[PDB]
């Protein structure tokens, strides 16, 4: 067995942000620094350890995390950022280990004359506590006045879909984001690298 | 901006359904409603569709007979009225949402359904 990395990088389908996909990488060796490398990768920020020196490091858990956010927040996704996309969707741990990804996705992902499947959080209750997805669709209840299970007036639908058209500016092209968190610790290690 | 032009609205006999068709400029990301105006009532959710996605919401007064498609082609958006019982006359207006602040943004003129017993 060689680790699926690649498989997950270039996968087919990616879920909205709303509700991400987590796959679990176990009893496999990962070859981090061909992706390193690799200009295929727009953003490779790693937060924890250097990428450099990742190539030899044995991991007790390496966890495969997937959404699609555009451009403009990419910078959200990171140790402690405050915005909607971060604050209501997902949220990196304060103490995050690991690598955020992400690779310009228009040429496939989007289609002429828009892709509205992908969708977002914006008005919740709460803010959402480190790696906690929300799938549900109760109506928002922001005005004093009792939604009472009707949309309207103080009833807001939480999903609303990004406008994914080919033409759309720099900032709202379509990116797909990869976020794997890094356990360290004295025990059977599933992926040990190379060695 | 974004205007829409609500037809097919008409009278029709107790039980028919009357299939309300809206065109609509600019569609594609806004999500669209259907509102209705009681006679002396003031109007209530009846259906709202996001785009490309089966996201429906309801009124329990309304629910299991209507149902929404989006074409995403022509612009439009489509109200199956099935076995409409007689008191449900009202007239239906297609709208559009930007970042949703006290309502809908956007109102088109609708058009008028009317049922006869």
């Known amino acids: 067995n060689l680790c699926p990395f690649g498989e997950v990088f270039n996968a087919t389908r990616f879920a909205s942000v709303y509700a991400w996909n987590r796959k679990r990488i176990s009893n496999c060796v990962a070859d981090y620094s061909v992706l390193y490398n690799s200009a295929s990768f727009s953003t490779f920020k790693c937060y924890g350890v250097s990428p450099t020196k990742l190539n030899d490091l044995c991991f007790t858990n390496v966890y495969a995390d997937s959404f699609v956010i555009r451009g403009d927040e990419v910078r959200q996704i990171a140790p402690g950022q405050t915005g909607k996309i971060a604050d209501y969707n997902y949220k990196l741990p304060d103490d995050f280990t690991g690598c955020v990804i992400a690779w310009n996705s228009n040429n496939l992902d989007s289609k002429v004359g828009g892709n509205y499947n992908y969708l977002y959080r914006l008005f919740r209750k709460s803010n959402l506590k480190p790696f906690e997805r929300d799938i549900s669709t109760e109506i928002y209840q922001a005005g004093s006045t009792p939604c009472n299970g009707v949309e309207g007036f103080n009833c807001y639908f939480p999903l609303q879909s990004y406008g994914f058209q080919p033409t759309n500016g720099v900032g709202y092209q379509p990116y797909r984001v990869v976020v794997l968190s890094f356990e360290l610790l004295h025990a059977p290690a599933t992926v040990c690298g190379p060695k | 901006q974004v205007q829409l032009v609500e037809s097919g609205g008409g009278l029709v006999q107790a039980g028919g359904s009357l299939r309300l068709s809206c065109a609509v400029s600019?569609?594609?990301?806004?999500?669209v409603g259907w509102f209705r105006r009681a006679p002396g009532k003031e109007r209530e959710f009846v259906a709202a569709?996001?785009?490309?996605?089966?996201?429906?919401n309801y009124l329990d007064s309304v629910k299991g007979r209507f149902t929404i498609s989006r074409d995403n082609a022509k612009n439009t958006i489509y109200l199956q009225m099935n076995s409409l019982k007689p008191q449900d006359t009202a007239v239906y207006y297609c709208?559009?949402?930007?970042?949703?602040?006290?309502?809908?943004?956007?109102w088109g003129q609708g058009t008028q359904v009317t049922v006869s017993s």
């Open positions: 600019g569609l594609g990301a806004h999500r």
């Open positions: 709208a559009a949402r930007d970042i949703e602040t006290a309502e809908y943004t956007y």
């Open positions: 569709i996001g785009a490309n996605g089966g996201n429906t």
